[PDB]
Amino acid sequence: LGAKPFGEKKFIEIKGRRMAYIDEGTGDPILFQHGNPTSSYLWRNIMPHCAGLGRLIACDLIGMGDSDKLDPSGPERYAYAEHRDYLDALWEALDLGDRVVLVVHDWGSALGFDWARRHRERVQGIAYMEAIAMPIEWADFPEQDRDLFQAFRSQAGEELVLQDNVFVEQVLPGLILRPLSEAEMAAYREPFLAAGEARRPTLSWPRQIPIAGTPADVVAIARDYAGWLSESPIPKLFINAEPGALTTGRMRDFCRTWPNQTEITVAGAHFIQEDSPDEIGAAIAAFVRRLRPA
Ligand SMILES: [Ca+2]
Ligand SMILES: [Ca+2]
Ligand SMILES: [Ca+2]
Ligand SMILES: [Cl-]
């Protein structure tokens, strides 16, 4: 469907750093949040389906996309709590109002689910896919990349990611079923062209996944939003994937218990936006049209 980005990038200063985002159209927001190691670019072929339905927003997480890096960077930087501080502040600055639709993926779902729990009166609907829906165990983690993610969460991680850019160059293509073009990979590589700390966000992220009880802070946050989502009557759209990756097994079983939820299944592994963007876009647009009748 295409390598061209959607909209043009806008910038805003947050906590002394410049963050980048797309913000197109008018009305109540439809807020698309990427995870690791992507950016707003992930949604480029999905956002068009929602033209005229709202204010279409996609933010680049701090240190990712065209958002500033956090210097001095190191192993303590780009934890979930730091990302949340920046993203909360950006979302506050964007004046989103009180009828937001969240569309979330991967770490964007942890961030968005947590924000939704804290700002529940403002959330009109939640569309999610390949999400971090609850704390998990290693047996729940997809078998293909289990050993690699264990290596990320070990001293080996710095060489794998900071030196060799494995998250961008191996994990990302490995979890997309169709071949990416030169331009698409260039867009994903761009924030991470430089070896070393420029790539830290793509290593800190796997180190934050709530697996086998650690990190305990993120485990607790995910336990909280898991409990809340399993009871909340807010309308939900679960975009399931086949074969899928993260939202399979026990996590998928849990997600299928959530109230007031519609489900569709699309082809894909993890980065399903690159495999089934039109199916995904059409489903989101239909969900929004139902949430926002004339
Ligand atoms: Ca209103
Ligand atoms: Ca192993
Ligand atoms: Ca090397
Ligand atoms: Cl990750």
Brief summary:
Belongs to the haloalkane dehalogenase family. Type 2 subfamily. By secondary structure, the chain is an alpha/beta fold.
Describe the model:
The chain has 294 residues and is an alpha/beta fold. It is 35% helix and 19% strand. α9 links the parallel β7 and β8. It starts with 9 loop residues before the first strand and ends with a helix. The structure holds calcium ion (3 copies) and chloride ion. One calcium ion binds at residues 97, 99. Residues 97, 99 line the site of one calcium ion. The PDB classes it as hydrolase. The entry lists the keywords haloalkane dehalogenase linb, 1\, 2\, 3-trichloropropane, hydrolase. It forms a monomeric assembly.
The spatial strand order of the largest sheet comes to: 1-2-4-3-5-6-7-8
Question: Number of DSSP strands?
Answer: 8
Distance between the termini: 30 Å
Each distinct ligand? calcium ion, chloride ion
What is the number of helical segments per DSSP (H or I, 4+ residues)? Answer: 10
Largest sheet: 8 strands, mixed
The CATH class is: Alpha Beta
**CATH superfamily name?**
Alpha/Beta hydrolase fold, catalytic domain
CATH architecture type: 3-Layer(aba) Sandwich
Binding site for chloride: 36, 107
Family: Belongs to the haloalkane dehalogenase family. Type 2 subfamily.
GO biological process, one term: response to toxic substance
Enzyme class: hydrolase
